[PDB]
Amino acid sequence: MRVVVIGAGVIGLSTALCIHERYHSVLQPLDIKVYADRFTPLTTTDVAAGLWQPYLSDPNNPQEADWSQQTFDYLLSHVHSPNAENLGLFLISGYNLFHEAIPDPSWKDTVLGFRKLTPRELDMFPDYGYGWFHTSLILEGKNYLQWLTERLTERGVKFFQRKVESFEEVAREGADVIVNCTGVWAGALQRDPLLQPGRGQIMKVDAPWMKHFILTHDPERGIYNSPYIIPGTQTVTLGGIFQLGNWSELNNIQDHNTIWEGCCRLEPTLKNARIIGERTGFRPVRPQIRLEREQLRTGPSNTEVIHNYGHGGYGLTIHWGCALEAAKLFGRILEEKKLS
Amino acid sequence: MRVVVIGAGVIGLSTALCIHERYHSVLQPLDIKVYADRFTPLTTTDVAAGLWQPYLSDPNNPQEADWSQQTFDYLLSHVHSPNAENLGLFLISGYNLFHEAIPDPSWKDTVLGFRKLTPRELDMFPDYGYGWFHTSLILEGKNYLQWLTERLTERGVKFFQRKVESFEEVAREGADVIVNCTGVWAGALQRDPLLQPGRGQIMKVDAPWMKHFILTHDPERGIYNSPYIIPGTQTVTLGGIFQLGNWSELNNIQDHNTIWEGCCRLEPTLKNARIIGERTGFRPVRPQIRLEREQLRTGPSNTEVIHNYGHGGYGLTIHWGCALEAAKLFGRILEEKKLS
Numbered sequence: 001m002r003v004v005v006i007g008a009g010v011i012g013l014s015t016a017l018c019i020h021e022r023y024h025s026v027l028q029p030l031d032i033k034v035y036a037d038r039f040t041p042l043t044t045t046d047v048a049a050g051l052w053q054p055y056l057s058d059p060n061n062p063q064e065a066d067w068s069q070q071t072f073d074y075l076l077s078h079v080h081s082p083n084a085e086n087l088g089l090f091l092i093s094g095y096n097l098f099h100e101a102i103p104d105p106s107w108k109d110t111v112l113g114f115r116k117l118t119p120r121e122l123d124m125f126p127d128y129g130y131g132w133f134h135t136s137l138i139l140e141g142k143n144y145l146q147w148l149t150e151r152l153t154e155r156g157v158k159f160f161q162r163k164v165e166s167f168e169e170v171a172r173e174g175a176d177v178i179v180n181c182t183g184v185w186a187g188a189l190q191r192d193p194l195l196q197p198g199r200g201q202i203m204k205v206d207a208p209w210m211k212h213f214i215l216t217h218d219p220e221r222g223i224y225n226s227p228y229i230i231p232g233t234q235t236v237t238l239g240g241i242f243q244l245g246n247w248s249e250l251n252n253i254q255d256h257n258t259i260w261e262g263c264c265r266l267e268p269t270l271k272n273a274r275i276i277g278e279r280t281g282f283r284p285v286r287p288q289i290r291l292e293r294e295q296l297r298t299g300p301s302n303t304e305v306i307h308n309y310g311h312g313g314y315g316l317t318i319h320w321g322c323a324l325e326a327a328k329l330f331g332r333i334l335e336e337k338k339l340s
Numbered sequence: 341m342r343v344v345v346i347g348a349g350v351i352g353l354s355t356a357l358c359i360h361e362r363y364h365s366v367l368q369p370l371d372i373k374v375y376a377d378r379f380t381p382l383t384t385t386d387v388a389a390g391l392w393q394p395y396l397s398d399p400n401n402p403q404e405a406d407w408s409q410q411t412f413d414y415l416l417s418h419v420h421s422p423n424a425e426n427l428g429l430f431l432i433s434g435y436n437l438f439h440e441a442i443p444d445p446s447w448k449d450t451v452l453g454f455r456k457l458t459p460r461e462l463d464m465f466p467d468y469g470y471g472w473f474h475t476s477l478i479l480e481g482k483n484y485l486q487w488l489t490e491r492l493t494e495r496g497v498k499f500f501q502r503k504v505e506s507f508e509e510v511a512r513e514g515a516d517v518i519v520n521c522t523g524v525w526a527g528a529l530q531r532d533p534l535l536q537p538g539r540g541q542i543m544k545v546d547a548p549w550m551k552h553f554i555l556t557h558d559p560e561r562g563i564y565n566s567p568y569i570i571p572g573t574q575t576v577t578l579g580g581i582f583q584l585g586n587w588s589e590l591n592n593i594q595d596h597n598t599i600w601e602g603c604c605r606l607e608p609t610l611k612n613a614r615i616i617g618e619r620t621g622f623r624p625v626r627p628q629i630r631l632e633r634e635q636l637r638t639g640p641s642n643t644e645v646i647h648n649y650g651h652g653g654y655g656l657t658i659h660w661g662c663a664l665e666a667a668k669l670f671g672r673i674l675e676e677k678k679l680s
């Protein structure tokens with residue numbers, strides 16, 4: 001059983017690890033290989049701040065709400081483990097500001113100590129008059145991806161830097177199961193009109209006095225098109241750009257100005273914070289995560305393919321639930337091959 | 341009117357600043373000088389982490405409860421000012437862990453978003469089964485003291501490195517009002533059996549993933565004789581020593597081992613944190629702050645004194661309320677001398 005996972009993002013690496021950990025003993029000819037065009041720190045996961053928060057609206061597939069929750073419970077179960085520093089995982093509390101009262105989220109009980117903001121807290125933010133306060137977790141992509149890489153290397157999963165042109169080229173080379181974790185670039189292997197790039201731009205700033213995240217929201221401009229401030233381990237992430245259909249992997253000046261003055265008005269202590277870096281990424285936007293199987297008509301034989309892409313701006317938030325679910329789909333392929 | 345403030349800690353400097361801004365134009369020859377044996381970074385204020393939190397019990401003088409709220413309200417009114425970085429001031433949420441249920445503190449409504457810990461939050465700390473969660477402030481003494489100095493220097497308040505032997509010495513030099521802010525060393529100028537050193541020791545550790553403060557409590561050990569973890573701007577403070585009657589300004593190895601084992605058990609991610617420094621300070625312990633006027637019998641005519649010391653382990657928590665109050669008693673001196 002030769003398995004080829006395409007993608008070295010949080011989706012591909014966690015899926016490869018979760019498949020190996022659940023199926024190493026039931027299948028000894030289990031050679032897992034990871035094909036990827038870019039690795040850390042050159043993936044979309046590296047650009048993400050790493051905060052655990054799903055979208056405010058319910059996810060159009062209630063199974064995604066569970067995948068988000070079991071990812072949170074799994075990460076929280078190791079947030080006080082001594083290796084949490086290596087994963088880039090830690091607790092963080094913060095605010096979610098609004099201009100008008102909105103209903104509570106579906107993940108209010110997943111989060112620790114969810115509550116609505118008191119008047120004295122709202123007075124620190126004059127432009128907003130309603131919001132939440134809650135304790136969540138941050139999984140920084142740079143540390144988490146390298147942690148997954150080393151653990152996959154411990155389990156004998158070889159890595160190869162190459163751009164896959166088609167599923168058939170991997171199938172014809174001997175692959176039995178192809179795990180499609182290509183993210184926003186998935187359409188290049190199979191056209192999907194529902195998948196489109198949600199381009200974002202973030203600023204990484206040195207402001208170590210920031211102990212809380214601050215996410216603002218405006219339904220007119222869309223989600224994450226509003227200033228947000230997310231403190232990480234060594235730096236503070238400033239963002240607020242979300243552009244559909246923009247393929248320009250290049251830092252914009254106007255977006256830089258939008259991010260800066262939006263967060264500076266939100267928190268005036270940032271005016272003296274030095275800018276360390278700035279990055280551009282593409283959220284794999286889709287109305288639904290494509291986590292499903294597909295038997296490919298490739299050749300006289302037929303290839304088995306597992307898709308998992310289209311996680312939008314919540315990939316790290318939902319990655320572990322998607323990895324477990326992709327491992328279950330891998331097990332059904334096993335039972336149908338007279339193999340489990 | 342020649343005023344002499346003895347003490348360059350948070351109590352001496354804030355009182356000298358609060359006195360001048362209220363009386364520099366009501367009083368034309370207002371020459372204020374600061375006499376101090378040690379300045380920053382060699383004062384007890386520099387050892388403190390800077391967390392705003394009073395004792396758990398009522399302060400035996402309900403005016404101190406007001407002084408603490410005045411300090412919180414004033415600091416909170418400057419937490420989003422762009423010069424808060426110069427003050428070393430920023431918001432921070434955190435935990436207060438207990439082994440079983442105890443009554444709520446009197447300052448519950450002063451802090452932001454006070455609440456009790458949920459069961460899932462208590463599961464992250466296996467030893468403690470009850471606790472609180474609230475948002476507070478941190479005023480790092482080093483940045484705050486150098487800020488107060490720069491203010492006072494701009495206003496013609498000259499500083500002098502000098503050990504004061506007696507009030508009579510200062511009054512001999514021509515001083516009209518003496519503001520005694522000598523902290524734990526006040527007994528060397530007037531014997532006070534109520535003032536004793538609450539020696540403490542803290543560890544400054546590099547663990548920037550710590551976003552919350554964690555204070556543990558044990559009624560058997562006494563307050564602050566239990567592990568606490570207070571993340572600062574550039575470092576994380578680890579403490580938990582409160583020893584009455586020890587004047588040894590020397591870091592102890594057993595106290596070091598007590599702090600390390602207590603905080604590492606409380607937070608296993610601290611196992612690999614770099615130790616940056618270690619400090620020892622003396623809390624000016626008193627059953628109540630001595631904030632009062634005293635006309636003492638030196639020379640053929642009196643020279644009046646204002647005492648401000650005995651703040652224990654909540655000096656930065658209460659400094660501003662005591663500074664305003666010491667300015668009021670300075671104003672009554674102006675009335676008794678018919679100067680206003």
Ligand SMILES: Cc1cc2nc3c(=O)[nH]c(=O)nc-3n(C[C@H](O)[C@H](O)[C@H](O)COP(=O)(O)OP(=O)(O)OC[C@H]3O[C@@H](n4cnc5c(N)ncnc54)[C@H](O)[C@@H]3O)c2cc1C
Binds near residue numbers: 052239310
């Ligand atoms: C600015 C910004 C901030 C974000 N913040 C958060 C956040 O705070 N929390 C959160 O949960 N999410 C956040 N996200 C979203 C998150 O980054 C993504 O959902 C997540 O990274 C998706 O990763 P992925 O594994 O699907 O693909 P990405 O990590 O891009 O990885 C794609 C992988 O597929 C590979 N690949 C693609 N095509 C081929 C090919 N043809 N041949 C070989 N390899 C190929 C790529 O090279 C790479 O290996 C943010 C996104 C952006 C843009």
Ligand SMILES: Cc1cc2nc3c(=O)[nH]c(=O)nc-3n(C[C@H](O)[C@H](O)[C@H](O)COP(=O)(O)OP(=O)(O)OC[C@H]3O[C@@H](n4cnc5c(N)ncnc54)[C@H](O)[C@@H]3O)c2cc1C
Binds near residue numbers: 392624654
């Ligand atoms: C380990 C530790 C942690 C702490 N943490 C906190 C905390 O988190 N939050 C909080 O609110 N408080 C905390 N405290 C308490 C806080 O540090 C003190 O309450 C506060 O610093 C009081 O300082 P002060 O101004 O009274 O005098 P200190 O800063 O000592 O300053 C005394 C000044 O008076 C001078 N002086 C004394 N005698 C003479 C003299 N005879 N002649 C000339 N000058 C003299 C001293 O040299 C110095 O200039 C902590 C204390 C310790 C020890």
Ligand SMILES: O=C(O)c1csc(Cl)c1
Binds near residue numbers: 050
């Ligand atoms: O996509 C984003 O910009 C984003 C900000 S917080 C979060 Cl979770 C995701």
Ligand SMILES: O=C(O)c1csc(Cl)c1
Binds near residue numbers: 540579
């Ligand atoms: O005295 C202390 O060690 C102390 C710890 S938190 C706080 Cl406020 C004071």
